[PDB]
Amino acid sequence: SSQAWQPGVAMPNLYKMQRMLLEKCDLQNYGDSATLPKGIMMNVAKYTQLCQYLNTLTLAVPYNMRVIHFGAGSDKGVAPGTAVLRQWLPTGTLLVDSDLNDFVSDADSTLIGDCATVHTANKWDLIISDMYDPKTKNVTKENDSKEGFFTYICGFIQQKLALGGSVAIKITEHSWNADLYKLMGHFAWWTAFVTNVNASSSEAFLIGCNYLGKPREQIDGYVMHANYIFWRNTNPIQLSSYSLFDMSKFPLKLRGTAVMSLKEGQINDMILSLLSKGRLIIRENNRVVISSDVLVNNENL
Amino acid sequence: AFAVDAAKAYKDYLASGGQPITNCVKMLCTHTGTGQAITVTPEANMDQESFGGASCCLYCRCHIDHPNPKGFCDLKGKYVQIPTTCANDPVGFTLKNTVCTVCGMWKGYGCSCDQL
Ligand SMILES: CC(C)C[C@H](N)C(=O)N1C[C@H](O)C[C@](C)(O)[C@@H](n2cnc3c2c(=O)n(C)c(=O)n3C)C1
Ligand SMILES: C[S@@+](CC[C@H](N)C(=O)[O-])C[C@H]1O[C@@H](n2cnc3c(N)ncnc32)[C@H](O)[C@@H]1O
Ligand SMILES: [Cl-]
Ligand SMILES: [Zn+2]
Numbered sequence A: 001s002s003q004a005w006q007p008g009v010a011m012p013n014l015y016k017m018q019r020m021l022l023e024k025c026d027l028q029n030y031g032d033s034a035t036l037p038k039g040i041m042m043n044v045a046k047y048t049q050l051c052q053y054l055n056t057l058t059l060a061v062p063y064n065m066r067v068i069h070f071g072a073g074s075d076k077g078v079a080p081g082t083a084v085l086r087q088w089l090p091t092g093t094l095l096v097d098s099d100l101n102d103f104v105s106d107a108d109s110t111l112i113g114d115c116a117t118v119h120t121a122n123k124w125d126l127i128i129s130d131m132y133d134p135k136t137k138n139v140t141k142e143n144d145s146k147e148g149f150f151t152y153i154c155g156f157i158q159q160k161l162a163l164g165g166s167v168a169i170k171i172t173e174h175s176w177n178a179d180l181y182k183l184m185g186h187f188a189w190w191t192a193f194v195t196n197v198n199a200s201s202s203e204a205f206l207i208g209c210n211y212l213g214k215p216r217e218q219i220d221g222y223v224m225h226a227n228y229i230f231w232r233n234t235n236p237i238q239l240s241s242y243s244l245f246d247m248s249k250f251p252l253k254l255r256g257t258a259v260m261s262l263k264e265g266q267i268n269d270m271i272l273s274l275l276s277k278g279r280l281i282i283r284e285n286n287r288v289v290i291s292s293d294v295l296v297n298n299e300n301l
Numbered sequence B: 001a002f003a004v005d006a007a008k009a010y011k012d013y014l015a016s017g018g019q020p021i022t023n024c025v026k027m028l029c030t031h032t033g034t035g036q037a038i039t040v041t042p043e044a045n046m047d048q049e050s051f052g053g054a055s056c057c058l059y060c061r062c063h064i065d066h067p068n069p070k071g072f073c074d075l076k077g078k079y080v081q082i083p084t085t086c087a088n089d090p091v092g093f094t095l096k097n098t099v100c101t102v103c104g105m106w107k108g109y110g111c112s113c114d115q116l
């Protein structure tokens, strides 16, 4: 009932526990659009609701936080989602974004190129991805796990997400990857969150809350995506913009979460318990250095 | 001795009846903020809209060098408050107007330092 006053709807735990088979996604409210406040873009609204939901979880929020945002450019040449993330994150948070095509951004640094060309020396506290190829919405072909940028994202998380860190990765009916769902089991908690403003779409953000660096739970990703679609197919979400009108508690609280460098082998059950509670980040606190690989070619004669 | 003058070109285009630059990124906020011109987080008051700064910067949006001899952008990475009556052209507004160095309000749209 009250779901219309929330920023969106997270997949209830019982649907996560099913063993459904994958079906086509048929949303009753398909094609409907929410009424956005005057002059507000869908992507501003969408990221605001995502951030409002993230405010309800046990995110670690250290001093000198590091956040990276893939898929940040729009067809308009600007980065609406980055602008919302920077509003949401504490002032001074280091924010890097990236996209295939050129765009103008408020991030501290921007890398233009395929995500597979992005390398970073440091680990990150939060990874956001809006990466999406609309050519995947081919309803006439079978819906298999996709590779492409999802393969990169899975490796990036395992190699460069700090222990205690969190992610939010955009998926849809056809844009999904089984190993990414499997990796959700390496977090203390996970969900698939649907924004109320975009509830007529099969889009969701797959959210991993507090990374543990090892499986807490064995998740079959083909089954979990079928479970996700089953949920969407059987649970119409009323489009709603209601939460956009109350921003008083929007900013992410600067928790000053502790950061420690530790070697694998110092990670005991007390450490894992603190990681699982949003009370600790494990990574080095060096300087943040990034780069984009550039392919060189000379096309002459 | 030649440099492109983008400011003047946009001012002349506007006067010629041209459509203001679009897709400036408008933020959701309380509209109970300080009303200062350029801030690290949205600060629109009741008579303003807040926008992501890069999207309101002529030089950022046109992919040209900033006039600063060092190339630094006043707006990028910040939020700009624009009077609601002028929010159809934030880029025009930020170009044409000036921030009071004392109180941080826009000259003539919040700055009262020059009053008795
Ligand atoms: C605007 C109307 C309400 C359309 C109505 N809903 C409808 O009649 N169709 C007929 C099709 O045959 C397929 C389907 C599954 O019945 C409907 N549909 C429902 N959810 C969908 C779709 C869809 O295509 N695509 C591509 C999606 O991505 N999702 C999430 C669309
Ligand atoms: C929905 S859009 C971006 C919306 C954007 N976040 C916003 O805030 O308006 C999807 C984006 O994902 C990007 N992207 C898609 N595939 C990519 C890939 N292999 N590598 C890097 N970026 C990709 C696209 O260029 C595209 O801009
Ligand atoms: Cl499972
Ligand atoms: Zn600029």
Ligand SMILES: [Zn+2]
Pocket: B100, B101, B102, B103, B104, B105, B111, B112, B113, B114
């Ligand atoms: Zn003044």
